[PDB]
Amino acid sequence: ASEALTMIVNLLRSQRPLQEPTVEQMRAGLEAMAQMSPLPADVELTTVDAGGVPGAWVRVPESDPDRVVLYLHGGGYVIGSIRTHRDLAQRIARAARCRVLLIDYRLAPEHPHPAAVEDSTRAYRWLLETGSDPKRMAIAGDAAGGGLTVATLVALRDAGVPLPAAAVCLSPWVDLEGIGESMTTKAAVDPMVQREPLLRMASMYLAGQDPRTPLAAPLYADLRGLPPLLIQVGTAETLLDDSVRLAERARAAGVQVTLEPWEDMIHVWQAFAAMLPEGQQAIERIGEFLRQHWQ
Template sequence: MASPELKTITELLRARQEQAPADISFPESRALFEQMTAAFPLPENVKSTPVDAGGIPSEWIAAQRVGDEQTIYWLHGGGYCIGSVNTHRGLLGRISAASRARVLAIDYRLAPEDPFPAAVEDAVAGYLWLLSTGVDPAQIVIGGDSAGGGLTAATLVALKEDGKPLPGAAVCISPWTDLALTGESLSTKAKADPMITIEGITRVRDAYLGDADPSAPLASPIYAGLSGLPPLLIQVGENEVLLDDSQRLAERAEAAGVDVTLEVWPEMIHVWHFFAAMLPEGQQAIDRIGEWVQQRLGAAVTAS
Protein backbone atom coordinates (compact mmCIF):
# COMPACT_ATOMS: atom_id res chain seq x y z
CA MET A 1 0.00 0.00 0.00
CA ALA A 2 1.26 3.45 -0.90
CA SER A 3 2.11 5.99 1.78
CA PRO A 4 -0.55 8.51 2.90
CA GLU A 5 1.59 11.29 1.45
CA LEU A 6 0.89 10.03 -2.08
CA LYS A 7 -2.81 10.83 -1.78
CA THR A 8 -2.08 14.39 -0.66
CA ILE A 9 0.39 14.96 -3.49
CA THR A 10 -1.96 13.45 -6.06
CA GLU A 11 -4.82 15.69 -4.94
CA LEU A 12 -2.62 18.79 -5.14
CA LEU A 13 -1.39 17.88 -8.60
CA ARG A 14 -4.90 17.16 -9.83
CA ALA A 15 -6.15 20.51 -8.55
CA ARG A 16 -3.23 22.26 -10.24
CA GLN A 17 -3.98 20.46 -13.49
CA GLU A 18 -7.65 21.44 -13.38
CA GLN A 19 -6.84 25.09 -12.69
CA ALA A 20 -4.26 25.46 -15.46
CA PRO A 21 -5.60 27.60 -18.33
CA ALA A 22 -5.90 25.74 -21.63
CA ASP A 23 -4.23 28.56 -23.55
CA ILE A 24 -1.21 28.97 -21.26
CA SER A 25 1.93 29.93 -23.18
CA PHE A 26 5.17 27.99 -22.99
CA PRO A 27 6.99 30.86 -21.23
CA GLU A 28 4.19 30.90 -18.65
CA SER A 29 4.40 27.11 -18.28
CA ARG A 30 8.14 27.37 -17.72
CA ALA A 31 7.65 29.98 -15.03
CA LEU A 32 5.02 27.85 -13.27
CA PHE A 33 7.29 24.81 -13.35
CA GLU A 34 10.11 26.87 -11.87
CA GLN A 35 7.74 28.08 -9.16
CA MET A 36 6.54 24.56 -8.34
CA THR A 37 10.00 23.03 -8.16
CA ALA A 38 11.29 25.84 -5.95
CA ALA A 39 9.72 23.79 -3.15
CA PHE A 40 12.41 21.14 -3.76
CA PRO A 41 15.75 22.95 -3.27
CA LEU A 42 19.22 21.47 -3.37
CA PRO A 43 19.63 19.16 -0.35
CA GLU A 44 22.10 20.02 2.38
CA ASN A 45 25.71 18.99 1.75
CA VAL A 46 25.21 19.14 -2.02
CA LYS A 47 26.98 21.76 -4.12
CA SER A 48 26.17 23.04 -7.60
CA THR A 49 28.69 24.68 -9.91
CA PRO A 50 27.89 26.23 -13.31
CA VAL A 51 29.93 24.98 -16.26
CA ASP A 52 30.03 25.61 -20.00
CA ALA A 53 29.78 22.14 -21.56
CA GLY A 54 30.99 22.90 -25.05
CA GLY A 55 28.73 25.91 -25.42
CA ILE A 56 25.79 24.40 -23.54
CA PRO A 57 24.88 26.02 -20.19
CA SER A 58 25.26 23.23 -17.66
CA GLU A 59 25.88 22.50 -14.02
CA TRP A 60 27.89 20.14 -11.90
CA ILE A 61 25.87 18.85 -8.95
CA ALA A 62 27.75 16.84 -6.37
CA ALA A 63 27.00 15.57 -2.89
CA GLN A 64 29.59 15.93 -0.16
CA ARG A 65 32.63 13.63 -0.45
CA VAL A 66 31.74 12.63 -4.02
CA GLY A 67 34.76 12.48 -6.32
CA ASP A 68 35.07 12.82 -10.07
CA GLU A 69 35.69 9.15 -10.88
CA GLN A 70 32.05 8.44 -11.69
CA THR A 71 29.62 10.73 -13.48
CA ILE A 72 25.89 10.76 -14.12
CA TYR A 73 25.03 12.73 -17.26
CA TRP A 74 21.43 13.91 -16.82
CA LEU A 75 18.84 15.14 -19.32
CA HIS A 76 15.92 16.85 -17.61
CA GLY A 77 12.26 16.31 -18.38
CA GLY A 78 9.56 18.79 -19.34
CA GLY A 79 8.10 17.62 -22.63
CA TYR A 80 11.02 19.16 -24.57
CA CYS A 81 9.34 22.54 -23.99
CA ILE A 82 9.85 23.38 -20.31
CA GLY A 83 12.21 22.42 -17.50
CA SER A 84 15.83 23.24 -16.79
CA VAL A 85 18.76 22.42 -14.59
CA ASN A 86 17.17 24.79 -12.10
CA THR A 87 13.89 22.83 -11.90
CA HIS A 88 15.74 19.54 -11.41
CA ARG A 89 18.51 20.61 -9.04
CA GLY A 90 16.85 19.15 -5.94
CA LEU A 91 16.17 15.81 -7.61
CA LEU A 92 19.69 15.58 -8.99
CA GLY A 93 21.25 16.43 -5.64
CA ARG A 94 19.46 13.43 -4.17
CA ILE A 95 20.53 11.22 -7.06
CA SER A 96 24.15 12.32 -6.60
CA ALA A 97 24.04 11.47 -2.90
CA ALA A 98 22.39 8.09 -3.46
CA SER A 99 24.71 7.14 -6.32
CA ARG A 100 27.88 8.57 -4.77
CA ALA A 101 28.59 10.12 -8.16
CA ARG A 102 28.70 13.67 -9.45
CA VAL A 103 25.99 14.78 -11.88
CA LEU A 104 26.43 16.84 -15.02
CA ALA A 105 23.07 18.35 -16.02
CA ILE A 106 22.69 20.34 -19.23
CA ASP A 107 20.23 23.00 -20.33
CA TYR A 108 19.56 21.70 -23.82
CA ARG A 109 17.58 23.90 -26.20
CA LEU A 110 13.81 23.81 -25.83
CA ALA A 111 10.91 23.83 -28.29
CA PRO A 112 9.09 25.53 -29.86
CA GLU A 113 11.98 27.99 -30.21
CA ASP A 114 14.35 25.13 -31.07
CA PRO A 115 12.43 22.08 -32.28
CA PHE A 116 13.58 18.52 -33.00
CA PRO A 117 16.36 17.51 -33.35
CA ALA A 118 17.93 20.37 -31.35
CA ALA A 119 17.59 18.54 -28.01
CA VAL A 120 19.27 15.42 -29.40
CA GLU A 121 22.08 17.49 -30.92
CA ASP A 122 22.72 19.22 -27.61
CA ALA A 123 22.55 15.98 -25.63
CA VAL A 124 25.14 14.39 -27.92
CA ALA A 125 27.34 17.51 -27.82
CA GLY A 126 27.25 17.66 -24.03
CA TYR A 127 28.22 14.00 -23.76
CA LEU A 128 31.10 14.44 -26.20
CA TRP A 129 32.29 17.44 -24.20
CA LEU A 130 32.27 15.28 -21.08
CA LEU A 131 34.41 12.70 -22.86
CA SER A 132 36.79 15.46 -23.96
CA THR A 133 37.55 16.19 -20.30
CA GLY A 134 39.11 12.75 -19.98
CA VAL A 135 36.25 10.93 -18.27
CA ASP A 136 36.18 7.18 -18.87
CA PRO A 137 32.92 6.41 -20.74
CA ALA A 138 32.61 3.16 -18.79
CA GLN A 139 32.28 5.29 -15.65
CA ILE A 140 29.43 7.41 -17.04
CA VAL A 141 25.74 6.73 -16.53
CA ILE A 142 23.44 8.67 -18.84
CA GLY A 143 19.98 9.31 -17.44
CA GLY A 144 16.84 11.36 -17.73
CA ASP A 145 13.26 11.72 -16.60
CA SER A 146 10.09 11.91 -18.71
CA ALA A 147 11.04 13.54 -22.03
CA GLY A 148 14.60 13.43 -20.74
CA GLY A 149 14.24 9.67 -20.41
CA GLY A 150 13.24 9.39 -24.04
CA LEU A 151 16.06 11.77 -24.92
CA THR A 152 18.44 9.49 -23.02
CA ALA A 153 17.50 6.54 -25.23
CA ALA A 154 17.63 8.70 -28.37
CA THR A 155 21.08 9.99 -27.42
CA LEU A 156 22.36 6.45 -26.98
CA VAL A 157 21.03 5.55 -30.43
CA ALA A 158 22.65 8.63 -31.97
CA LEU A 159 25.99 7.91 -30.30
CA LYS A 160 25.89 4.30 -31.42
CA GLU A 161 25.09 5.27 -35.01
CA ASP A 162 27.99 7.74 -34.99
CA GLY A 163 30.40 5.14 -33.64
CA LYS A 164 31.07 7.08 -30.43
CA PRO A 165 32.00 5.41 -27.12
CA LEU A 166 28.86 4.56 -25.18
CA PRO A 167 28.43 5.15 -21.45
CA GLY A 168 28.59 2.28 -19.02
CA ALA A 169 24.88 2.30 -18.18
CA ALA A 170 21.64 4.26 -18.54
CA VAL A 171 18.72 5.20 -16.28
CA CYS A 172 15.27 6.24 -17.51
CA ILE A 173 12.61 7.54 -15.12
CA SER A 174 9.09 7.48 -16.58
CA PRO A 175 10.50 7.91 -20.11
CA TRP A 176 8.46 9.32 -22.99
CA THR A 177 9.62 7.11 -25.85
CA ASP A 178 6.76 7.13 -28.37
CA LEU A 179 5.85 10.54 -29.76
CA ALA A 180 3.43 8.84 -32.13
CA LEU A 181 1.31 8.43 -28.98
CA THR A 182 0.23 4.85 -29.65
CA GLY A 183 0.51 3.49 -26.10
CA GLU A 184 -2.68 2.01 -24.65
CA SER A 185 -1.98 3.51 -21.23
CA LEU A 186 -2.54 6.99 -22.68
CA SER A 187 -6.23 6.12 -22.41
CA THR A 188 -6.35 3.35 -19.81
CA LYS A 189 -4.41 5.39 -17.22
CA ALA A 190 -5.85 8.81 -18.10
CA LYS A 191 -8.07 9.01 -15.02
CA ALA A 192 -5.35 7.76 -12.67
CA ASP A 193 -2.63 10.17 -13.88
CA PRO A 194 -2.83 13.56 -12.10
CA MET A 195 -0.08 15.16 -14.18
CA ILE A 196 -0.30 14.40 -17.91
CA THR A 197 -3.33 14.76 -20.18
CA ILE A 198 -3.58 13.65 -23.79
CA GLU A 199 -4.25 17.25 -24.78
CA GLY A 200 -1.17 18.49 -22.97
CA ILE A 201 1.16 15.81 -24.27
CA THR A 202 -0.10 16.28 -27.83
CA ARG A 203 0.55 20.01 -27.59
CA VAL A 204 4.16 19.65 -26.50
CA ARG A 205 4.70 16.84 -29.01
CA ASP A 206 3.55 19.07 -31.85
CA ALA A 207 5.66 21.98 -30.60
CA TYR A 208 8.76 19.79 -30.45
CA LEU A 209 8.34 17.87 -33.69
CA GLY A 210 6.92 20.48 -36.02
CA ASP A 211 6.68 18.66 -39.36
CA ALA A 212 9.00 15.81 -38.33
CA ASP A 213 7.81 12.20 -38.34
CA PRO A 214 6.62 11.17 -34.84
CA SER A 215 8.05 7.71 -35.51
CA ALA A 216 11.54 8.99 -36.36
CA PRO A 217 13.97 6.88 -34.29
CA LEU A 218 15.68 9.87 -32.67
CA ALA A 219 12.29 11.32 -31.69
CA SER A 220 10.71 8.04 -30.61
CA PRO A 221 13.48 5.60 -29.69
CA ILE A 222 11.17 2.60 -29.37
CA TYR A 223 11.25 2.58 -33.19
CA ALA A 224 15.06 2.61 -33.29
CA GLY A 225 17.52 -0.23 -33.47
CA LEU A 226 18.43 -0.78 -29.83
CA SER A 227 21.04 -3.53 -30.06
CA GLY A 228 24.38 -2.75 -28.51
CA LEU A 229 23.09 -0.30 -25.91
CA PRO A 230 24.46 -0.44 -22.35
CA PRO A 231 22.58 -1.90 -19.35
CA LEU A 232 19.37 0.02 -18.76
CA LEU A 233 17.31 0.69 -15.63
CA ILE A 234 13.74 1.87 -16.23
CA GLN A 235 11.52 3.02 -13.38
CA VAL A 236 7.89 3.88 -14.05
CA GLY A 237 4.77 4.40 -11.96
CA GLU A 238 1.75 2.14 -12.24
CA ASN A 239 -0.60 5.13 -12.43
CA GLU A 240 0.81 7.13 -15.32
CA VAL A 241 -0.16 7.45 -18.95
CA LEU A 242 3.42 6.77 -20.08
CA LEU A 243 3.45 3.30 -18.50
CA ASP A 244 3.32 1.64 -21.93
CA ASP A 245 6.20 3.78 -23.18
CA SER A 246 8.40 2.28 -20.47
CA GLN A 247 7.17 -1.25 -20.91
CA ARG A 248 7.58 -1.22 -24.68
CA LEU A 249 11.06 0.31 -24.43
CA ALA A 250 12.01 -2.47 -22.03
CA GLU A 251 10.51 -5.18 -24.25
CA ARG A 252 12.17 -3.94 -27.43
CA ALA A 253 15.53 -3.31 -25.81
CA GLU A 254 15.50 -6.74 -24.19
CA ALA A 255 14.56 -8.34 -27.51
CA ALA A 256 17.60 -6.57 -29.01
CA GLY A 257 19.87 -8.15 -26.40
CA VAL A 258 20.13 -5.23 -23.98
CA ASP A 259 20.43 -5.96 -20.25
CA VAL A 260 17.21 -4.31 -19.01
CA THR A 261 15.86 -3.85 -15.49
CA LEU A 262 12.23 -2.67 -15.56
CA GLU A 263 10.62 -1.58 -12.30
CA VAL A 264 6.91 -0.74 -12.25
CA TRP A 265 6.24 0.90 -8.89
CA PRO A 266 2.72 0.16 -7.58
CA GLU A 267 0.37 3.15 -7.38
CA MET A 268 3.13 5.64 -8.22
CA ILE A 269 2.66 8.63 -10.51
CA HIS A 270 4.80 10.26 -13.19
CA VAL A 271 8.36 10.95 -11.94
CA TRP A 272 7.30 10.55 -8.29
CA HIS A 273 10.98 10.94 -7.42
CA PHE A 274 10.45 14.71 -7.63
CA PHE A 275 8.52 14.59 -4.37
CA ALA A 276 11.16 12.67 -2.39
CA ALA A 277 11.32 15.37 0.28
CA MET A 278 7.80 14.43 1.35
CA LEU A 279 7.07 11.11 -0.39
CA PRO A 280 8.85 8.05 1.07
CA GLU A 281 8.54 6.11 -2.17
CA GLY A 282 10.29 8.93 -4.00
CA GLN A 283 13.42 8.61 -1.88
CA GLN A 284 13.18 4.82 -2.01
CA ALA A 285 13.22 4.92 -5.81
CA ILE A 286 16.20 7.28 -5.79
CA ASP A 287 18.03 5.01 -3.37
CA ARG A 288 17.33 2.11 -5.71
CA ILE A 289 18.84 4.10 -8.60
CA GLY A 290 21.90 4.73 -6.44
CA GLU A 291 22.33 1.04 -5.69
CA TRP A 292 21.93 0.09 -9.34
CA VAL A 293 24.38 2.74 -10.52
CA GLN A 294 27.00 1.61 -8.04
CA GLN A 295 26.51 -2.03 -9.04
CA ARG A 296 26.92 -1.22 -12.73
CA LEU A 297 29.86 1.15 -12.41
CA GLY A 298 31.53 -1.18 -9.96
CA ALA A 299 31.13 -4.01 -12.47
CA ALA A 300 32.71 -1.80 -15.14
CA VAL A 301 35.73 -1.19 -12.91
CA THR A 302 36.10 -4.93 -12.30
CA ALA A 303 35.82 -5.69 -16.01
CA SER A 304 38.47 -3.13 -16.91
Protein backbone atom coordinates in the same frame (compact mmCIF):
# COMPACT_ATOMS: atom_id res chain seq x y z
CA ALA B 1 1.23 3.60 -0.98
CA SER B 2 2.16 6.32 1.52
CA GLU B 3 -0.27 8.97 2.75
CA ALA B 4 2.19 11.43 1.16
CA LEU B 5 1.23 9.98 -2.26
CA THR B 6 -2.52 10.65 -1.77
CA MET B 7 -1.74 14.19 -0.57
CA ILE B 8 0.38 15.05 -3.63
CA VAL B 9 -2.23 13.55 -5.99
CA ASN B 10 -5.09 15.58 -4.53
CA LEU B 11 -2.99 18.75 -4.52
CA LEU B 12 -2.02 18.27 -8.21
CA ARG B 13 -5.64 17.38 -9.10
CA SER B 14 -6.90 20.49 -7.33
CA GLN B 15 -4.31 22.89 -8.86
CA ARG B 16 -4.45 21.58 -12.46
CA PRO B 17 -5.28 24.56 -14.77
CA LEU B 18 -8.92 24.64 -15.98
CA GLN B 19 -7.64 25.51 -19.47
CA GLU B 20 -4.56 24.70 -21.51
CA PRO B 21 -1.49 26.68 -20.29
CA THR B 22 0.88 28.47 -22.67
CA VAL B 23 4.57 27.52 -22.93
CA GLU B 24 5.40 30.64 -20.85
CA GLN B 25 3.03 29.55 -18.05
CA MET B 26 4.14 25.88 -17.93
CA ARG B 27 7.76 27.09 -17.84
CA ALA B 28 7.12 29.53 -14.98
CA GLY B 29 4.74 27.12 -13.21
CA LEU B 30 7.27 24.26 -13.15
CA GLU B 31 9.92 26.77 -12.01
CA ALA B 32 7.65 27.75 -9.10
CA MET B 33 6.70 24.21 -8.09
CA ALA B 34 10.42 23.40 -8.21
CA GLN B 35 11.19 26.11 -5.62
CA MET B 36 9.07 24.28 -3.01
CA SER B 37 11.80 21.61 -2.85
CA PRO B 38 14.78 23.53 -1.35
CA LEU B 39 18.40 22.52 -2.01
CA PRO B 40 20.25 21.07 1.04
CA ALA B 41 23.21 23.05 2.39
CA ASP B 42 25.87 20.48 1.40
CA VAL B 43 24.92 20.50 -2.30
CA GLU B 44 27.59 22.09 -4.51
CA LEU B 45 26.45 23.55 -7.85
CA THR B 46 29.11 24.64 -10.37
CA THR B 47 28.06 26.31 -13.66
CA VAL B 48 30.07 25.12 -16.65
CA ASP B 49 30.13 25.38 -20.45
CA ALA B 50 29.61 21.77 -21.61
CA GLY B 51 31.14 22.10 -25.11
CA GLY B 52 28.82 24.95 -26.08
CA VAL B 53 25.98 23.46 -24.01
CA PRO B 54 25.36 25.34 -20.72
CA GLY B 55 25.31 23.18 -17.60
CA ALA B 56 26.04 22.68 -13.95
CA TRP B 57 27.91 20.04 -12.03
CA VAL B 58 25.95 18.87 -9.00
CA ARG B 59 28.11 17.35 -6.28
CA VAL B 60 27.66 16.46 -2.60
CA PRO B 61 30.54 15.71 -0.13
CA GLU B 62 30.03 11.94 -0.74
CA SER B 63 30.51 12.35 -4.53
CA ASP B 64 33.36 10.53 -6.27
CA PRO B 65 34.53 12.91 -9.08
CA ASP B 66 35.58 9.96 -11.31
CA ARG B 67 31.93 8.80 -11.59
CA VAL B 68 29.65 10.97 -13.73
CA VAL B 69 25.97 10.97 -14.68
CA LEU B 70 24.92 13.07 -17.64
CA TYR B 71 21.41 14.04 -16.57
CA LEU B 72 18.79 15.07 -19.10
CA HIS B 73 15.78 16.85 -17.56
CA GLY B 74 12.15 16.29 -18.59
CA GLY B 75 9.44 18.81 -19.49
CA GLY B 76 8.12 17.69 -22.91
CA TYR B 77 11.24 18.98 -24.69
CA VAL B 78 9.54 22.41 -24.16
CA ILE B 79 10.04 23.22 -20.43
CA GLY B 80 12.46 22.54 -17.58
CA SER B 81 15.87 23.90 -16.58
CA ILE B 82 18.99 23.35 -14.49
CA ARG B 83 16.98 24.84 -11.63
CA THR B 84 13.85 22.66 -12.03
CA HIS B 85 15.82 19.40 -11.84
CA ARG B 86 18.78 20.24 -9.59
CA ASP B 87 17.06 18.61 -6.60
CA LEU B 88 16.54 15.32 -8.44
CA ALA B 89 20.14 15.66 -9.72
CA GLN B 90 21.60 16.04 -6.17
CA ARG B 91 19.57 13.10 -4.80
CA ILE B 92 21.06 10.94 -7.54
CA ALA B 93 24.57 12.36 -6.96
CA ARG B 94 24.03 11.51 -3.30
CA ALA B 95 22.63 8.00 -3.93
CA ALA B 96 25.13 6.98 -6.64
CA ARG B 97 27.96 8.85 -4.83
CA CYS B 98 28.80 10.55 -8.15
CA ARG B 99 28.93 13.91 -9.93
CA VAL B 100 25.95 14.79 -12.12
CA LEU B 101 26.17 17.06 -15.14
CA LEU B 102 22.78 18.75 -15.49
CA ILE B 103 22.65 20.42 -18.92
CA ASP B 104 20.34 23.20 -20.07
CA TYR B 105 19.73 21.65 -23.47
CA ARG B 106 17.95 23.68 -26.16
CA LEU B 107 14.12 23.56 -25.92
CA ALA B 108 11.17 23.57 -28.38
CA PRO B 109 9.42 25.42 -29.93
CA GLU B 110 12.37 27.88 -30.14
CA HIS B 111 14.73 25.02 -30.89
CA PRO B 112 12.85 21.96 -32.28
CA HIS B 113 14.09 18.41 -32.68
CA PRO B 114 16.86 17.52 -33.11
CA ALA B 115 18.44 20.44 -31.19
CA ALA B 116 18.04 18.53 -27.88
CA VAL B 117 19.90 15.43 -29.17
CA GLU B 118 22.58 17.64 -30.72
CA ASP B 119 23.19 19.15 -27.25
CA SER B 120 23.12 15.91 -25.25
CA THR B 121 25.58 14.12 -27.56
CA ARG B 122 27.81 17.21 -27.57
CA ALA B 123 27.78 17.34 -23.76
CA TYR B 124 28.59 13.61 -23.70
CA ARG B 125 31.48 14.05 -26.20
CA TRP B 126 32.72 16.99 -24.07
CA LEU B 127 32.79 14.68 -21.01
CA LEU B 128 35.15 12.28 -22.86
CA GLU B 129 37.24 15.22 -24.11
CA THR B 130 37.73 16.45 -20.52
CA GLY B 131 38.86 12.98 -19.32
CA SER B 132 35.76 11.06 -18.13
CA ASP B 133 35.89 7.26 -18.68
CA PRO B 134 32.65 5.69 -20.12
CA LYS B 135 33.16 2.72 -17.75
CA ARG B 136 32.44 5.23 -14.93
CA MET B 137 29.66 7.09 -16.79
CA ALA B 138 25.92 6.94 -17.26
CA ILE B 139 23.17 8.89 -18.96
CA ALA B 140 19.92 9.36 -17.07
CA GLY B 141 16.76 11.39 -17.46
CA ASP B 142 13.07 11.71 -16.70
CA ALA B 143 10.19 11.53 -19.15
CA ALA B 144 11.15 13.64 -22.21
CA GLY B 145 14.68 13.42 -20.76
CA GLY B 146 14.18 9.65 -20.45
CA GLY B 147 13.38 9.54 -24.16
CA LEU B 148 16.29 11.87 -24.84
CA THR B 149 18.56 9.39 -22.91
CA VAL B 150 17.70 6.56 -25.30
CA ALA B 151 17.99 8.80 -28.35
CA THR B 152 21.40 10.04 -27.14
CA LEU B 153 22.69 6.47 -26.75
CA VAL B 154 21.49 5.54 -30.25
CA ALA B 155 23.01 8.68 -31.79
CA LEU B 156 26.34 8.20 -30.01
CA ARG B 157 26.45 4.52 -31.03
CA ASP B 158 25.73 5.35 -34.68
CA ALA B 159 28.51 7.94 -34.52
CA GLY B 160 30.97 5.28 -33.31
CA VAL B 161 31.31 6.97 -29.88
CA PRO B 162 32.05 4.73 -26.82
CA LEU B 163 28.84 4.20 -24.88
CA PRO B 164 28.61 4.52 -21.07
CA ALA B 165 28.44 1.80 -18.42
CA ALA B 166 24.68 2.13 -17.93
CA ALA B 167 21.64 4.32 -18.39
CA VAL B 168 18.52 5.21 -16.47
CA CYS B 169 15.06 6.31 -17.63
CA LEU B 170 12.44 7.68 -15.20
CA SER B 171 8.89 7.58 -16.61
CA PRO B 172 10.34 7.98 -20.15
CA TRP B 173 8.39 9.46 -23.04
CA VAL B 174 9.19 7.63 -26.25
CA ASP B 175 5.85 7.48 -28.15
CA LEU B 176 5.10 10.95 -29.52
CA GLU B 177 1.66 9.80 -30.81
CA GLY B 178 0.40 8.54 -27.40
CA ILE B 179 -1.10 5.27 -28.71
CA GLY B 180 -0.11 3.18 -25.68
CA GLU B 181 -3.03 1.53 -23.84
CA SER B 182 -2.36 3.30 -20.51
CA MET B 183 -2.89 6.63 -22.31
CA THR B 184 -6.57 5.60 -22.61
CA THR B 185 -7.05 3.28 -19.56
CA LYS B 186 -4.79 4.89 -16.90
CA ALA B 187 -5.85 8.41 -17.99
CA ALA B 188 -7.19 10.18 -14.86
CA VAL B 189 -5.25 8.22 -12.23
CA ASP B 190 -2.23 10.30 -13.32
CA PRO B 191 -2.78 13.92 -12.12
CA MET B 192 -0.19 15.10 -14.67
CA VAL B 193 0.27 13.87 -18.29
CA GLN B 194 -2.83 13.75 -20.45
CA ARG B 195 -2.82 12.87 -24.15
CA GLU B 196 -3.89 16.33 -25.41
CA PRO B 197 -1.08 18.32 -23.64
CA LEU B 198 1.34 15.54 -24.52
CA LEU B 199 0.63 15.67 -28.26
CA ARG B 200 0.78 19.49 -28.22
CA MET B 201 4.38 19.32 -26.92
CA ALA B 202 5.12 16.58 -29.46
CA SER B 203 3.93 19.01 -32.14
CA MET B 204 6.26 21.75 -30.87
CA TYR B 205 9.32 19.45 -30.63
CA LEU B 206 8.69 17.86 -34.04
CA ALA B 207 7.90 21.08 -35.95
CA GLY B 208 6.44 19.05 -38.82
CA GLN B 209 8.77 16.02 -38.65
CA ASP B 210 7.35 12.47 -38.75
CA PRO B 211 6.26 11.63 -35.14
CA ARG B 212 8.16 8.29 -35.47
CA THR B 213 11.45 10.00 -36.30
CA PRO B 214 13.65 7.49 -34.39
CA LEU B 215 15.81 10.03 -32.49
CA ALA B 216 12.65 11.95 -31.54
CA ALA B 217 10.49 8.86 -30.68
CA PRO B 218 13.00 6.12 -29.69
CA LEU B 219 10.27 3.48 -29.55
CA TYR B 220 11.10 3.32 -33.30
CA ALA B 221 14.89 3.51 -32.88
CA ASP B 222 17.36 0.63 -33.32
CA LEU B 223 18.30 -0.25 -29.72
CA ARG B 224 20.96 -2.95 -30.34
CA GLY B 225 24.25 -2.42 -28.43
CA LEU B 226 22.78 -0.19 -25.72
CA PRO B 227 24.27 -0.61 -22.19
CA PRO B 228 22.32 -1.94 -19.16
CA LEU B 229 19.10 0.07 -18.87
CA LEU B 230 17.08 0.73 -15.67
CA ILE B 231 13.54 1.92 -16.39
CA GLN B 232 11.49 3.12 -13.40
CA VAL B 233 7.82 3.81 -14.08
CA GLY B 234 4.69 4.26 -11.92
CA THR B 235 1.67 2.02 -12.53
CA ALA B 236 -0.76 4.99 -12.22
CA GLU B 237 0.92 6.74 -15.17
CA THR B 238 -0.54 7.40 -18.62
CA LEU B 239 3.03 6.82 -19.87
CA LEU B 240 3.25 3.34 -18.29
CA ASP B 241 3.15 1.59 -21.66
CA ASP B 242 5.91 3.90 -22.95
CA SER B 243 8.11 2.02 -20.40
CA VAL B 244 6.54 -1.37 -21.10
CA ARG B 245 7.02 -0.96 -24.88
CA LEU B 246 10.58 0.40 -24.37
CA ALA B 247 11.54 -2.56 -22.21
CA GLU B 248 10.02 -5.01 -24.72
CA ARG B 249 11.87 -3.38 -27.63
CA ALA B 250 15.21 -3.00 -25.80
CA ARG B 251 15.22 -6.60 -24.55
CA ALA B 252 14.37 -7.94 -28.03
CA ALA B 253 17.48 -5.98 -29.20
CA GLY B 254 19.62 -7.81 -26.59
CA VAL B 255 19.81 -4.94 -24.10
CA GLN B 256 20.01 -5.89 -20.43
CA VAL B 257 16.85 -4.07 -19.35
CA THR B 258 15.47 -3.77 -15.84
CA LEU B 259 11.82 -2.61 -15.85
CA GLU B 260 10.77 -1.47 -12.35
CA PRO B 261 6.98 -0.80 -12.12
CA TRP B 262 6.29 1.00 -8.82
CA GLU B 263 2.73 0.28 -7.73
CA ASP B 264 0.44 3.34 -7.64
CA MET B 265 3.31 5.76 -8.42
CA ILE B 266 2.64 8.83 -10.50
CA HIS B 267 4.65 10.53 -13.18
CA VAL B 268 8.30 11.16 -12.16
CA TRP B 269 7.33 10.58 -8.52
CA GLN B 270 11.09 10.77 -7.68
CA ALA B 271 10.86 14.58 -8.17
CA PHE B 272 8.73 14.59 -4.97
CA ALA B 273 11.30 12.61 -2.88
CA ALA B 274 11.60 15.50 -0.39
CA MET B 275 8.17 14.47 0.96
CA LEU B 276 7.32 11.19 -0.85
CA PRO B 277 8.97 8.07 0.69
CA GLU B 278 8.68 5.96 -2.50
CA GLY B 279 10.33 8.87 -4.32
CA GLN B 280 13.41 8.57 -2.13
CA GLN B 281 13.29 4.74 -2.21
CA ALA B 282 13.27 4.83 -6.03
CA ILE B 283 16.28 7.17 -6.12
CA GLU B 284 18.22 4.95 -3.67
CA ARG B 285 17.60 2.17 -6.16
CA ILE B 286 18.94 4.36 -9.01
CA GLY B 287 22.18 4.82 -7.05
CA GLU B 288 22.37 1.10 -6.30
CA PHE B 289 21.87 0.21 -10.00
CA LEU B 290 24.50 2.71 -11.09
CA ARG B 291 27.10 1.63 -8.51
CA GLN B 292 26.62 -2.00 -9.56
CA HIS B 293 27.49 -1.16 -13.19
CA TRP B 294 30.48 1.10 -12.33
CA GLN B 295 32.67 -1.35 -10.39
